[PDB]
Amino acid sequence: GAMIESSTTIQVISAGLPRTGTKSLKNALEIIYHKPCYHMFEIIFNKQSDIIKWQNLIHDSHMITTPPPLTTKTIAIYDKLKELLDGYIATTDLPTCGFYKDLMNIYPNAKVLLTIRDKYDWLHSLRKVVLPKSNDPWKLKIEEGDKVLGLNSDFYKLTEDSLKFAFQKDDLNFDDDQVLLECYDEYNRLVQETVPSDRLLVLRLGDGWEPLCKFLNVEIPNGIDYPCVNSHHQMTQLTEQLIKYKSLDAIIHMFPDLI
Ligand SMILES: Nc1ncnc2c1ncn2[C@@H]1O[C@H](COP(=O)(O)O)[C@@H](OP(=O)(O)O)[C@H]1O
Ligand SMILES: O=[N+]([O-])c1cc(N[C@H]2CCCNC2)ccc1CO
């Protein structure tokens, strides 16, 4: 097709939870739009100073009133969301995903995606990467790799608090598998009920380019397979390699599409 000049503003809001293909989707949107897409990895590798800004936004989020109409204090929070997202064309992953309903109002011309997968596969992936059980020794290896990246308790609070925000729950027993499975199902159901159908595309993990591209009115990138990155196995290798080399820059060339 023809080449058109696309606006550098949030055009796609992805409500999918972590471990539902968000990093692949991030990569795919960057291939389509040639501008950056937000993701937790943006925070980790490019913008660690934004950790505190997101935590502040989550803390004050109780002041939001579901619009319409727009109250004054909702606007103060909405304005900070826009600043954090300046220069990006899309959002995925924590901490943004729980803000999907507010992002729809801030960016009324944006389309909304929901990525879903088998709930047990999701839980098992989350346990290996994001939220191991308290008694799991792997939790200590994840912590040791995070130190190499400059991440500490503040980053852990943002991860946990942004999941609590997405699930709308302060008393979340992160060690309880049944609790997390119920929150996952209820979250995904609630997105489908909140977003107008003309604005929403529900994607199952592994669907590939075609439905996404039709939804966005763009051509399929020629000669490019749909990204497949960020498996729990690859996340395990990253953690092990960070612990071994004690720096990111010594190993970054080994993860070309992930990082
Ligand atoms: N194109 C694709 N097809 C199937 N699964 C994919 C995929 N891209 C990513 N994934 C899976 O999505 C999960 C990563 O999601 P996120 O990037 O949101 O953390 C990983 O699951 P596993 O941990 O089960 O391998 C990864 O294997
Ligand atoms: O799903 N992830 O990839 C994901 C991973 C982490 N922690 C990883 C980051 C890299 C160092 N080792 C620990 C934190 C949040 C998310 C949510 O995106």
Side-chain angles (χ1 to χ4, degrees), residues 1-234 236-259:
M3 304 301 296
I4 69 170
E5 188 170 3
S6 170
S7 182
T8 302
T9 187
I10 299 299
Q11 291 188 43
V12 174
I13 299 164
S14 172
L17 292 165
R19 315 308 299 173
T20 64
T22 62
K23 186 54 169 63
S24 290
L25 176 58
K26 174 193 201 297
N27 282 16
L29 294 170
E30 293 181 354
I31 289 157
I32 289 163
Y33 288 108
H34 312 295
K35 294 291 185 170
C37 176
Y38 217 87
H39 187 270
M40 186 61 89
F41 285 21
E42 284 297 321
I43 292 179
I44 291 168
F45 298 106
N46 290 330
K47 288 204 188 175
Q48 285 186 16
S49 63
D50 290 350
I51 294 168
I52 187 162
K53 306 185 181 197
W54 279 107
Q55 185 70 64
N56 290 346
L57 226 39
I58 296 165
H59 186 81
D60 296 333
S61 70
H62 61 79
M63 304 190 227
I64 300 178
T65 296
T66 290
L70 257 75
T71 70
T72 67
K73 293 179 179 179
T74 304
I75 280 170
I77 290 162
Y78 280 12
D79 220 277
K80 287 194 215 168
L81 259 183
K82 288 201 66 271
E83 307 165 353
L84 275 163
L85 295 178
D86 186 59
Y88 294 91
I89 44 80
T91 62
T92 63
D93 195 11
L94 303 174
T96 70
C97 61
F99 288 96
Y100 71 91
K101 190 219 86 202
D102 306 291
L103 294 166
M104 294 176 69
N105 292 122
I106 294 170
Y107 302 101
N109 304 306
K111 297 192 140 196
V112 180
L113 295 180
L114 177 67
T115 51
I116 60 179
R117 68 186 299 186
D118 179 87
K119 71 200 265 193
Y120 284 99
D121 286 351
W122 171 79
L123 176 67
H124 299 162
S125 187
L126 191 85
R127 287 287 185 218
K128 286 190 150 147
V129 177
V130 178
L131 207 65
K133 279 181 179 165
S134 283
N135 63 336
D136 190 338
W138 182 245
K139 171 191 70 167
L140 301 181
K141 302 296 155 180
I142 299 178
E143 293 188 11
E144 191 173 357
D146 281 348
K147 291 175 186 173
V148 180
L149 297 178
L151 306 164
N152 60 7
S153 60
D154 294 306
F155 176 78
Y156 293 136
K157 183 176 178 50
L158 174 59
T159 301
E160 292 180 358
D161 288 5
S162 63
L163 249 193
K164 294 185 197 187
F165 180 70
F167 292 153
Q168 300 167 261
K169 236 160 179 295
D170 188 29
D171 57 350
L172 192 53
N173 188 334
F174 293 117
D175 283 343
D176 190 322
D177 283 357
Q178 280 181 2
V179 173
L180 295 177
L181 291 167
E182 197 187 335
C183 288
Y184 178 86
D185 279 356
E186 163 57 41
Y187 180 91
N188 293 327
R189 180 183 72 75
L190 199 69
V191 174
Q192 296 169 86
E193 296 186 10
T194 310
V195 182
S197 56
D198 292 307
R199 228 173 143 185
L200 181 66
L201 176 56
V202 183
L203 289 171
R204 300 201 66 103
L205 191 53
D207 277 348
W209 280 119
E210 300 102 313
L212 172 67
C213 288
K214 292 175 185 175
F215 187 56
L216 301 179
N217 287 304
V218 300
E219 292 271 37
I220 299 181
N222 175 30
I224 304 173
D225 296 337
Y226 186 85
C228 191
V229 300
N230 206 23
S231 69
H232 69 84
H233 301 285
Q234 191 181 32
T236 296
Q237 178 72 5
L238 178 53
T239 289
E240 291 181 343
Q241 293 287 260
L242 287 166
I243 293 169
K244 175 64 187 196
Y245 290 75
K246 300 194 177 56
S247 81
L248 169 65
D249 285 359
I251 66 172
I252 195 170
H253 62 287
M254 290 158 44
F255 303 88
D257 300 317
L258 184 63
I259 304 183

